[PDB]
């Protein structure tokens, strides 16, 4: 039976006896809890370090995948030779461990990475202070807390106590979290700011509207949970910000599901609040929660305002974007069909598509493990009812990076959003009279970080009008919805050297073809979040009949070496158009760079004030010879920096460098090595060393 309500709860036994326990059993031997403390005040380290001290809620609020302190008082001092207890977190009326809705938390010696556990960190009289760690994939919601003491007769569990109810939120600060956001200023703006600016008007007359998102005000966090309860969203999926943002897309509007806001553009607004009267999200959500009915009325920016609150409250970083000249496709063919009468006026009966002076929606920040690497980061989500998506008015999450390159096959609703920002306007009388390729999506903006100014983010959705890539990506989007095969492969790509990209064409027909193509090379985070485009090329190629043809693209090291991070990979888009037939061939692939190694060993005792030897070893990883190889050794507490030069290292050859050091700062110190030569450059090795 579906466990789809956070507000529902089950009764957990306090004296969970098993079998036929004899009368006169003496449970006095076993621990019992006299008191639980969560250090939940808003000045204390839990809420401050978890960035939850702004919520008005007086319960404990923490973010998943991060440690917090509790303290349990027992009737006598806890003694691990006779006592065994655990903490339990429970959510919903039908909790199950294999669905993540019953969470046992064992008392462990050492916390383990990414795993629920609790560690005893202090013991005074009858109490124990616990450091509890939650999983970074934890369900987001309000949990009941219990202490369970194990006995030969069964479990003895604390009573239901609403004061230890605990909220667990998404964690933009935890790097194992799907919503990790490694930039503090962006976390401050997209999570913790409860005031925003929404842009509207027209392109050459841009207006601004203040908005009180208010995600921290009393009752708002509870309402967001009630929204998911109202959607009948399974609890076990609520730790996935893809499901949470797609549920929110549907539930912020009233269609289909009794959601928050009734939309209206009829200029009368009978029996309700007219859309331009609202100045924030709180009165809408609080009225929705107390009335338990949709609130009248809203328009696009009100939908986006309330959606933004829902997302930021739960801890998904989010922002509102404004699109000027926004197309609403009604027949999913990805272009604006505008039918004119012979007279010249727009035939309003045949014309079902429309474009608006502006339209607002949301972007939600998350990894996309359901898509290939390179498509995480900003995802477009829209709660304004426009078109049905799989039977309901909802939209997204659609990867903004997938939209840019027109890979609209990736879920969710990427074709529709692409048509909102870059559809062609097709004027039809049935003789096609004109095409306007530049009008839709003239400008896309969002509030700048740390000010009320406008940030132009058009280039994230689309290439610049007039460039060949804007056409090729649109023809890609259309094809997704000549007897030529296209593939590409990247030849032996080693970190720190140039490499070649090999695009091959096979023409199996008897025809000569002309091809026009572009290439986009990008650096991506290990989790699949895009970081930046570092190379972009358009090229033309002629294709002789019955032929194979390879086009070699050199990627110089200087083009990418400045924008790398740990475990970062490369993401390539290639799109070719066969000009004679308008056929388009698109591919995207990722690769991981081969990483040359630098082993650092140390020989001798590592004590402040006696000499020890560092051994830096390096192997030439190439089938070529390396010249003027400078090796460097940095060791802040261990050595002043030092260099060795090698005039030549032959292929697959190994050099060794021995260096005498004498540390002067005791503790946890570190050694770092670097290698640069004429070809391979800026390769590193590292070693942690303990110095006495």
């Amino acid at each position: 039976p579906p466990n789809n309500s956070n507000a529902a709860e089950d009764d957990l036994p306090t004296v969970e006896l098993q079998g036929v326990v004899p009368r006169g059993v003496n449970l006095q031997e076993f621990l019992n809890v006299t008191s639980v403390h969560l250090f939940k005040e808003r000045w204390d380290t839990n809420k401050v370090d978890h960035h939850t001290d702004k919520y008005e809620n007086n319960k404990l609020i923490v973010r998943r995948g991060q440690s917090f302190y509790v303290q349990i008082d027992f009737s006598r001092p806890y003694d691990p030779r006779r006592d065994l207890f655990r903490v339990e977190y429970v959510i919903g009326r039908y909790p199950q461990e294999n669905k993540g809705t019953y969470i046992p938390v064992p008392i462990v010696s050492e916390l383990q990475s990414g795993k629920w556990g609790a560690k005893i960190v202090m013991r005074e009289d009858r109490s124990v202070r616990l450091s509890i760690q939650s999983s970074p994939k934890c369900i987001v919601g309000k949990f009941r807390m219990y202490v369970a003491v194990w006995t030969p007769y069964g479990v003895l569990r604390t009573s239901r106590n609403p004061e230890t109810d605990t909220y667990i939120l998404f964690n933009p600060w935890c790097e194992d979290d799907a919503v990790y956001l490694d930039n503090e200023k962006e976390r401050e703006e997209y999570v913790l700011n409860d005031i925003g600016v929404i842009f509207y008007g027209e392109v050459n007359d841009i207006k601004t509207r203040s908005w009180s998102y208010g995600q921290f005000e009393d009752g708002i966090l509870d309402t967001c949970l009630y929204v998911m309860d109202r959607a009948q969203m399974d609890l076990s999926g609520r730790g996935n910000p893809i499901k949470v943002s797609r549920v929110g897309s549907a539930m912020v509007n009233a269609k289909d599901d009794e959601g928050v806001l009734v939309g209206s553009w009829d200029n009368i607004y009978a029996y309700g609040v007219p859309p331009s009267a609202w100045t924030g999200s709180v009165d809408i959500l609080l009225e929705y929660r107390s009335s338990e009915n949709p609130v009248r009325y809203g328009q696009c920016w009100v939908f986006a305002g309330v959606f933004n609150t829902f997302l930021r409250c739960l801890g998904i970083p989010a922002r509102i974007v404004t699109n000027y000249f926004s197309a609403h496709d009604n027949d999913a063919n990805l272009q604006m069909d505008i039918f004119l009468e012979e007279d010249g006026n727009v035939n309003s009966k045949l014309t079902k598509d429309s474009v608006w002076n502006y339209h607002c929606w949301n972007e939600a920040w998350m990894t996309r493990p359901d898509l290939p690497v390179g498509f995480g980061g900003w995802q477009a989500v829209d709660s304004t009812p426009q078109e049905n998506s799989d039977g309901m008015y909802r939209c997204g999450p659609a990867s903004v990076q997938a939209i840019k390159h027109g890979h609209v096959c990736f879920q969710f609703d990427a074709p529709f959003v692409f048509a909102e920002v870059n559809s062609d306007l097709i004027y039809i009388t049935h003789v096609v009279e004109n095409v306007d390729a530049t009008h839709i999506g003239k400008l896309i903006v969002t509030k700048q970080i740390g000010g009320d100014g406008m940030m132009d983010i058009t280039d994230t959705y689309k290439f610049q009008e007039g460039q060949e890539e804007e056409r090729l990506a649109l023809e890609t989007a259309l094809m997704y919805g000549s007897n030529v095969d296209m593939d590409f492969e990247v030849e032996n790509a080693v970190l720190g050297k140039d490499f070649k990209l090999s695009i091959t064409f096979r023409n199996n027909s008897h025809n000569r073809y002309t091809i026009t193509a572009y290439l986009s090379a990008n650096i991506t985070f290990y989790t699949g979040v895009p970081k930046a485009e570092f190379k972009k090329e358009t090229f033309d190629v002629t294709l002789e009949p019955l032929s194979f043809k390879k086009e070699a693209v050199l990627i110089q090291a200087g083009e990418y070496m400045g924008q790398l991070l740990e475990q970062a990979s490369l993401h390539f888009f290639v799109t070719a158009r066969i000009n004679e037939t308008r056929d388009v061939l698109a591919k995207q692939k990722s690769t991981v760079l081969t990483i040359p190694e630098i082993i650092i060993k140390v020989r001798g005792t590592q004590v402040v004030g006696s000499d020890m030897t560092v051994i830096v070893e390096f192997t030439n990883p190439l089938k070529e010879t390396l010249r003027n190889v400078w090796v460097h050794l940095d060791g802040p507490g261990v050595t002043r920096p030092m260099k060795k030069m090698f005039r030549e290292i032959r292929p697959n050859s190994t050099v060794q460098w021995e260096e005498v050091c004498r540390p002067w700062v005791s503790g946890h110190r570190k050694l770092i090595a670097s290698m640069s030569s004429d070809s391979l450059r800026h390769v590193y090795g590292e070693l942690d060393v303990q110095i006495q």
């Binding site: 331009s276 604006m336 727009v346 079902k352 474009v355 002076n357 306007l425």
Partner: peptide, 7 residues
């Protein structure tokens, strides 16, 4: 105001 400007 938010209005249709074509169609």
């Amino acid at each position: 105001f938010x209005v249709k400007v074509i169609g």
